[PDB]
């Protein structure tokens, strides 16, 4: 109808959007689309699974904005240890969840014309995938790299092992290549953008003054306002969805908001001077300069960035300092205060990015390889 089937570590119901949302909303207007939803146990209470909240529906189809939703709930899902000793249980446990997947899994593989695989758990459905509907196109979106998500060996081993037999291997980043084992099927294809950006910029949510935006909580470092906020008095600091509240650093000039929608988010982007990425740790991967989603939505705008140096990357308008240098932080800022707002990059929305995640070999430019 085109099918599509997506596997990942997110369910698409999670208020939090994150870009295999985007891309899920844009399958769902081509398709059929349903959204498997992995490495959920009853374990998974145990550390604190942002869904939770769906847990009464585990295990069901449940009907979402047009995509049929599953959260698989096992008693335990495999995961990385961090310990080297308990490398064999891992493998074993990996083993054991690929080898029990859920009917609903097997049938909706089957259905399917597409499957997505997300970077990370979904690597351990793939050889499934092709055994049970040869004939769908394999499609891994890498969000992230794996040795950054820190995915049990397992997963890395088996991501080498059936990389090669994946029909589009869609790279947020060029950066994250020196770590795929594979060639020929590897592609880039950065995150997209609402084709109506724009449009929700509009109207300002600032009355007069200076006023900066942060949004999003990835690696949320409250110190980083708490010394912006002092030394820029005459900033608004504009705090949304940090994933925490207001930190007791942080001045009268810093407004701190609860998760907001994205179209929402996007009024503050566009009529801010200039927006933050205050990631707490430069401990990032070089593609986070590419993959970061509010960098990315600052960028659309050509709205000029602080962020730390190790996510500044290949980018103008971006103004690095490094985490816990107070100095560092107000030269970020002075210098992202003076900086033109220019629209050096250029950012297909998620319908064009969705195209080109499909089949990027119909866009010959998102080859990585010969
Ligand atoms: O209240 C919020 C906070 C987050 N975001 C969006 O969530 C995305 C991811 O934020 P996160 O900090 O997790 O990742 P990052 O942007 O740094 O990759 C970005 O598009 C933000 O626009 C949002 O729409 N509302």
């Not at 099918?3 to 570590?9: A, D, I, K, N, P």
């Not at 009917?103 to 695989?117: A, P």
């Not at 935006?213 to 008095?233: I, T």
């Not at 430069?282 to 939505?297: N, R």
Request: aromatic share 12%.
């Amino acid at each position: 109808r085109p099918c599509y089937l997506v596997l990942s570590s997110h369910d698409f119901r999670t208020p939090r959007r994150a870009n295999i949302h985007f891309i899920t909303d844009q399958l769902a207007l081509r398709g059929t689309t349903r959204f498997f939803s992995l490495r959920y146990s009853r374990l998974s209470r145990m550390k604190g699974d942002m869904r939770l909240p769906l847990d009464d529906t585990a295990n069901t189809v449940v009907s979402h904005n047009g995509v049929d939703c599953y959260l698989w709930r096992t008693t335990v899902h495999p995961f990385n240890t961090r310990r080297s000793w308990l490398r064999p249980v891992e493998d074993a446990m990996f083993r054991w969840y690929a080898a029990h997947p859920p009917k609903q899994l097997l049938d909706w593989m089957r259905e399917s014309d597409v499957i997505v695989f997300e970077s990370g758990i979904a690597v351990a459905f793939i050889e499934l995938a092709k055994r049970v509907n040869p004939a769908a196109k394999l499609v891994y979106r890498a969000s992230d790299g794996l040795s950054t998500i820190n995915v049990a060996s397992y997963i890395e081993r088996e991501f080498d092992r059936v990389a090669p037999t994946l029909d589009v291997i869609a790279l947020v980043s060029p950066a994250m290549a020196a770590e795929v084992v594979s060639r020929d099927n590897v592609f880039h294809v950065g995150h997209g953008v609402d084709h109506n950006l724009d449009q929700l910029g509009d109207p300002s949510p600032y009355a007069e003054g200076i006023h900066a935006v942060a949004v999003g909580s990835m690696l949320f470092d409250p110190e980083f306002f708490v010394v912006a906020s002092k030394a820029f008095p005459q900033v608004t600091f504009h705090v949304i969805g940090s994933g925490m509240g207001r930190h007791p650093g942080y001045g009268d000039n810093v407004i701190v908001y609860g998760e907001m929608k994205h179209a929402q988010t996007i009024g503050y982007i566009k009529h801010a001077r200039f927006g933050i990425a205050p990631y707490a740790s430069e401990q990032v991967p070089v593609y986070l300069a590419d993959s970061s989603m509010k960098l990315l939505q600052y960028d659309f705008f050509g709205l000029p960035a602080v962020c730390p140096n190790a996510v500044v990357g290949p980018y103008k308008s971006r103004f690095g300092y490094t985490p816990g240098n107070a100095d560092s932080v107000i030269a970020a800022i002075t210098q992202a205060l003076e900086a033109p707002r220019v629209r050096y990059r250029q950012c297909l929305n998620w319908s064009d990015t969705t195209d080109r995640v499909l089949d990027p070999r119909a866009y010959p430019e998102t080859r990585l390889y010969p």
